[PDB]
Each structure stands twice: as structure tokens, then as C-alpha cells.
């Protein structure tokens, strides 16, 4: 509360000489508590994963030869060579009977 006559801050019924400010630590930081309290204000837990019930084998032309997980963002995003791009997937296949040979 502020005294309406002298414009002075009052603390526990006593006036203070000076410009009262609320003390705080460096940049308003507060010590962390329990780990479960790290989710106060954070979004709720994510939902269960979407896992396909069945699996259909793709065509060879739609299958990657390189099984590295991060190959699309680490190499292919910066690689643009035509033949190198061609060797990224398997080639389409058939049978001798289907070719009439």
C-alpha cells in the first residue's frame, strides 16, 4: 500500500523512505522443484502412435536402396547429380514369360 498523502510505500503499517522495489534474483529466476512439475503449463501427454494393422510390400521402383535414416536431409537435399539420383531406388522388374521370351 501507498500513503495517499506523502506518496510513500507502507510496509506492515510503517512508511519507508525511498523508492520501494520488489526484490528478485538474477533476471527473475526461480529454483526448479520436482521433475513432474516441469509439465505445469506444458501440453498434455502425446497420444498413442498410429501403427498400421497390415503391411503391403511396395514396388521395387518405390523402394530405397539406401537404408540410412537421415540420407534424404543430409545428402540428397544437397546432392543433385543425375546418375546418383537414378541409383537411389531399385529398378522395375518383370519376368521372362511376361516379356514373351
Amino acid at each position: 500500500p501507498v500513503d495517499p498523502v506523502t506518496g510513500q510505500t507502507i510496509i506492515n503499517g510503517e512508511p519507508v523512505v525511498g523508492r520501494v522495489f520488489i526484490m528478485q534474483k538474477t533476471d527473475g529466476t526461480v529454483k526448479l522443484g520436482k521433475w513432474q512439475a516441469q509439465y505445469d503449463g506444458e501440453p498434455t501427454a502425446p497420444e498413442a502412435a498410429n501403427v498400421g494393422s497390415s503391411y503391403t510390400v511396395p514396388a521395387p521402383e518405390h523402394t530405397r536402396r539406401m537404408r540410412g535414416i537421415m540420407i534424404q536431409s543430409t545428402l540428397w537435399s544437397i546432392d543433385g547429380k543425375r546418375s546418383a539420383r537414378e541409383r537411389r531406388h531399385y529398378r522395375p522388374q518383370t519376368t521372362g514369360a511376361a516379356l514373351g521370351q
Partner: protein, 298 residues
């Protein structure tokens, strides 16, 4: 070489964005915004003299031609009715021989798409919407077009995949989260692509000491999440269903319609066109009744 650094987190955390000064200046200089067309706000109180118009129905006539000039300069070029119309019959959806005008049908669907983006996804494009120019930049083909390649292509995160979280919300392991290190690598690749699409680094949306935390991350992360959801709408309900309209040269090797990603609008910038505001002066593209208190005539 001077480096322009922008602090995005608390001091000492290491959350900063670095830029090379020379290339940043060259890249910023080369952008050329089309000048806004002079407003047309004195049309007569008459009915619409339009035969085949199912989108621009709430718009006056003079502002209709204003929008048409803007659309031409944004997609095809100044003037140039020949890219979407035939000069003789502007209301015709088909060529004189009989073939339908696919560019005009695409432009109609994409008028609807632009209105949907500006109206239903304000949480991403706050007060700075999009026009045809943001994606097209004066050309008929935008950037970042992608098609079906393989199952583990992370761009499917913007079409039909859902869920990218891998981090456990507990100290101890359980069956609530059984993510593999490979799934973490997939998320890493997707986020590297996002970072390069906006020209930023990981700390723009993350405090990397805990990637899962939203309170320790800058507000941009929230915006980024909405940008995912918007894309999933755009790619599912507007771009993909346009498969039977395009000629075969437009589709992919599986014969599917081109789709959009973050770099389609952003083109390697934290904001499209460095945050240029263009749609505030083109009410036909708004999805709202007002942009910045400026009301929509109707």
C-alpha cells in the same frame, strides 16, 4: 566477413541465429514486391454481370477487375489473359476446340485455397496473410513441389502422417513411449528440412537442452506447429484432389498432383518475403470480415 546475429533466447544459453551479411543483403535486395494496385471503391450499386463465377461472388465489379489484374501479375504476368482465359469469351471454361482450360480451373480452386489459408489459419499468418505472389512469385510453378517417392519420405508428415514425438515424459522407461532411435533420426531429418526451409537453426524453435519443452522454447515453435496443420489441410483438400485436372507433364512419376511444403511459401526465410504485407490491400483474398479493423464491404 561480418555475421549478423539475432538473439532468440536468454543470455548465455547459446540460442542465436547467425547470418552472413553479404549474402543476406544480396538476397534481400533481389526481392521485388509488385506495387499495390490503386483502390477501386466507387462501383455502382448494380448486379454482377458475371456468367460463370462461383468464388468471387461477394465482391464488387471494379474490385473484381482489380483482383484479375493482380492475379495475372502474380501468376502469369502483367496483362496476359492467355494463360487462364481465351480472349474472345472470358466466361468460357473450355478452349475453342473443346479442351477444358485447366489453368482456369486450378486458379478457381486456388482462389478457394487462398481464402481458406487466410481465413481458417490466422494462427500462422497473423495479419500477414498470403497472396498468389507468396507462392508463385510471378511464375506459374512455385518452389518446393514434391510428389510420392517412398514410404519413409518425411514430407508425408505434411500429407497423411501424424505424430513426430519421440521423447519420454517420465524419468523411467515404460510402454507409454517405445520410440526407436531410428524414429528419432527420422524426426531429425524432418526438422533439418524445416530449419533449411526457414533459413534458421534448431534454436529458433527449441532450447536443445530439452527438445520436448514448449515453455523453454521461443513462441515460434507454436506457430510452426500450426504451419504443419495448415499444410495438412492444403495438401489434402486443395492440391491433391486436383489430380485429374493437370496434364501429365504436371504430375509426378506415380501420376499424383504436386504438393506444397514450408519452403513453398518461405523460400528459405523466417517469414515469407521477409514479412512483406500484400494481402491487406486485396480484400478478395481475405477469409475474414476485416483484416486490421478495415471492414470487408460485401
Amino acid at each position: 566477413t561480418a555475421t549478423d546475429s539475432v538473439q532468440v533466447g536468454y543470455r548465455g544459453t547459446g540460442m542465436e541465429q547467425n547470418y552472413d551479411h553479404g549474402d543476406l543483403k544480396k538476397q534481400f535486395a533481389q526481392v521485388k514486391i509488385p506495387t499495390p494496385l490503386p483502390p477501386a471503391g466507387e462501383s455502382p450499386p448494380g448486379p454482377l454481370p458475371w456468367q460463370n463465377v462461383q468464388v468471387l461472388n461477394d465482391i464488387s465489379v471494379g474490385e473484381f477487375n482489380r483482383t484479375m489484374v493482380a492475379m495475372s501479375t502474380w501468376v502469369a504476368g502483367t496483362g496476359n489473359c492467355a494463360y487462364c482465359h481465351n480472349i474472345a469469351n472470358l466466361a468460357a471454361d473450355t478452349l475453342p476446340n473443346g479442351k477444358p482450360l485447366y489453368t482456369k480451373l486450378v486458379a478457381r480452386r486456388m482462389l478457394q485455397m487462398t481464402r481458406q489459408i487466410n481465413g481458417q489459419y490466422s494462427q500462422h499468418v497473423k495479419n500477414t496473410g498470403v497472396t498468389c505472389y507468396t507462392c508463385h512469385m510471378g511464375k506459374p510453378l512455385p518452389n518446393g513441389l514434391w510428389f510420392y517417392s517412398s514410404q519413409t519420405d518425411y514430407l508425408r508428415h505434411y500429407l497423411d502422417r501424424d505424430g513426430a514425438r519421440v521423447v519420454t515424459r517420465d524419468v523411467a522407461p515404460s510402454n507409454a513411449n517405445r520410440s526407436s532411435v531410428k524414429q528419432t533420426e527420422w524426426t531429425y531429418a524432418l526438422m533439418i528440412s524445416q530449419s533449411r526451409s526457414l533459413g534458421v537453426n534448431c534454436t529458433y524453435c527449441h532450447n536443445t537442452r530439452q527438445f520436448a519443452s514448449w515453455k523453454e522454447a521461443p513462441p515460434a515453435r507454436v506457430t510452426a506447429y500450426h504451419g504443419i496443420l495448415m499444410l495438412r489441410d492444403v495438401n489434402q483438400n486443395y492440391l491433391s484432389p486436383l489430380q485429374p485436372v493437370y496434364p501429365s507433364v504436371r504430375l509426378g512419376t506415380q501420376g499424383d498432383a504436386p504438393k506444397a511444403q514450408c519452403v513453398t511459401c518461405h523460400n528459405g526465410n523466417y517469414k515469407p518475403l521477409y514479412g512483406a504485407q500484400m494481402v491487406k490491400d486485396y480484400p478478395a483474398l481475405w477469409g475474414r470480415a476485416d483484416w486490421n479493423g478495415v471492414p470487408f464491404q460485401g
